[PDB]
Enzyme design. Sequence first.
Site, PDB file in Angstrom:
ATOM      1  N   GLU A 291       0.784  -1.223   0.000  1.00 59.49           N
ATOM      2  CA  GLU A 291       0.000   0.000   0.000  1.00 59.49           C
ATOM      3  C   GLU A 291       0.828   1.291   0.000  1.00 59.49           C
ATOM      4  O   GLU A 291       0.288   2.346  -0.337  1.00 59.49           O
ATOM      5  CB  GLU A 291      -0.744   0.048   1.336  1.00 59.49           C
ATOM      6  CG  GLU A 291      -1.771  -1.026   1.385  1.00 59.49           C
ATOM      7  CD  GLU A 291      -2.910  -0.924   0.404  1.00 59.49           C
ATOM      8  OE1 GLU A 291      -3.078   0.210  -0.189  1.00 59.49           O
ATOM      9  OE2 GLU A 291      -3.716  -1.799   0.261  1.00 59.49           O
TER      10      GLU A 291
ATOM     11  N   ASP B  49      -6.807   6.803  -3.986  1.00 63.83           N
ATOM     12  CA  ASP B  49      -6.294   5.474  -4.207  1.00 63.83           C
ATOM     13  C   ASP B  49      -6.394   5.073  -5.725  1.00 63.83           C
ATOM     14  O   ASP B  49      -6.772   5.935  -6.533  1.00 63.83           O
ATOM     15  CB  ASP B  49      -6.935   4.489  -3.231  1.00 63.83           C
ATOM     16  CG  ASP B  49      -8.336   4.062  -3.539  1.00 63.83           C
ATOM     17  OD1 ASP B  49      -8.859   4.593  -4.591  1.00 63.83           O
ATOM     18  OD2 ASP B  49      -8.911   3.255  -2.870  1.00 63.83           O
TER      19      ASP B  49
END
EC number: 3.2.1.17
Length: 162
Positions: free
Chosen positions: A11, A20
């Site tokens: 991540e 994102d």
Amino acid sequence: MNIFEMLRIDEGLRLKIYKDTEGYYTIGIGHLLTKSPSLNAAKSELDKAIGRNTNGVTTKDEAEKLFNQDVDAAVRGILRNAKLKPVYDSLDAVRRAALINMVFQMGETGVAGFTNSLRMLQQKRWDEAAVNLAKSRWYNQTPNRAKRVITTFRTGTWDAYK
Ligand SMILES: [Cl-]
Ligand SMILES: [Cl-]
């Protein structure tokens, strides 16, 4: 290697609000804030999450605290999920981390829908599950990551992350 390190690799770490892979506001180590298009909505959720007026930015410590909470929540969600628990219980340690990764990314509901793959994993038919898992939007949208996770299920080692 362990789950934390794994996920930190997948991540990354960002201390300012960012969008994102799906265009949603997130912060830290993949902590989703909101699916709303509004940045104010996002700053509000951040503030609520941190317990202070952040103005869209967190410190390293704060982000790690969200991460700890998110990992914990992920494990706990699996162990409470009827479709998931039995899978996780049948797996070895490395593979359990692969399952957690997926639930952290997609949510337990999302993972619980890979019925076919889950059954294969439970039956320890590695290659087959690996192939089934790849037939998903998840793999087509974030292929490098999906590939690491899938390799992890296939081999039961951390080679994909070394
Ligand atoms: Cl929260
Ligand atoms: Cl990816």
